[PDB]
Amino acid sequence: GLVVSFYTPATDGATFTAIAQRCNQQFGGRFTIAQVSLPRSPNEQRLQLARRLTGNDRTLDVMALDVVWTAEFAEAGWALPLSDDPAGLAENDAVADTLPGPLATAGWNHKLYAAPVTTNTQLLWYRPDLVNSPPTDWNAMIAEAARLHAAGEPSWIAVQANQGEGLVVWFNTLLVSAGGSVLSEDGRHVTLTDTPAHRAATVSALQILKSVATTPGADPSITRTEEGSARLAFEQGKAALEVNWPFVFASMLENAVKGGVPFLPLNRIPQLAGSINDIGTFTPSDEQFRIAYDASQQVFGFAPYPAVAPGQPAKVTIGGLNLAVAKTTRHRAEAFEAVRCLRDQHNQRYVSLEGGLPAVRASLYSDPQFQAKYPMHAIIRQQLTDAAVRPATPVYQALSIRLAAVLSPITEIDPESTADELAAQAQKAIDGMG
Ligand SMILES: O=C(NC[C@H]1O[C@H](O[C@H]2O[C@H](CO)[C@@H](O)[C@H](O)[C@H]2O)[C@H](O)[C@@H](O)[C@@H]1O)c1ccccc1
User: Fold this and answer.
1) Which of 59, 201, 207, 285 is at a distance of 20 to 30 A from 83, taking alpha carbons?
2) Nearest CA-CA partner of 9 in 65, 72, 89
3) What residue ranges do the domains of the chain occupy?
């Protein structure tokens, strides 16, 4: 029958393709979900979607939106409210057995405009064979990096922050964790330098950024434009400390089996032969997973995101993907139905274990079978309970562009002056000027 188009980031194409096929198996030819890939960066995903929406592309049905786009897609009319479900089942499905942080990312003006499907929070990833204890705060991060440098060991502090969204996420985590915030509650005012407490928070966050930027043996990938990967940097042994979304767990196990991790030769274990499936996805059996994980644990460990205020955990910036139905769709009923099918318990288990994307279903974090395969469940749920959030605003696109342009390169940050420049550019963004 009809085709429901499902637009997702390209790096999550395969995963969602698999999920879509599963859901296609449960409709009996009544309709078919077809996944379509968007670019890699949140901004370009947004741009493609916005062009199809303003272009009245009536073939656009379901969209996997980054959490930061809700405000814009709701205010524009692009994302239909879940209350526009003809069957009226969308809102109840979205809130049922779903963590409250994701649900908050999916809302605007007291209405849900999307159903969360995946969430995200960044953890610390370290080489337990080179680091006897994972640092619990950022000055400890810097000290460990310097000490590793004073031993020929890899000294990078791999953070996925080039000159875009990831850098803004780093800054927002540091700022909120320092007690600050980019915008007021209502999003109408800039709160980076408007009180001494807020200014102090911004200055501290900028100071951490600069100190990581200029720490002995730091990244020479910060001082230019090339979209480098902190994940691959860690997997290539160039870094013994990384902060990154938890998909790097799956990747590390997968690429180590494909032979792509020098310090973790899972490819040389006979029992893991064939654990890669015909589409290239690491799909171990239970015993194969025990083998791979217990071998990984000698060179790969995870820990909470490093705090800024020692003695209390950080407020880590939440990310992820919410399923929205485009206002262009021709079959609202089937779009919302497909949304409900894409986020069910089975496909959530899959999107987490195979796809590396944290699920939004709370039951899974209380599920022992899931916890045994996702050993980072407790820290992820705890950081999502305590999560920092980026400002929900219809002008987040321009806001993030301006903030990123000011923050990069982080080697040129001067905390006070940079704080003032940041507040001024954010003011420009929320003034509807660029
Ligand atoms: O952090 C980076 N960009 C900001 C977004 O990060 C995540 O999304 C990105 O990573 C996930 C993997 O967990 C992919 O699935 C997404 O497609 C990708 O956009 C957060 O989920 C999202 O909320 C943030 O907006 C980043 C990291 C590394 C290199 C470049 C950019």
Assistant:
1) 59
2) 65
3) 2-120+319-385, 123-303
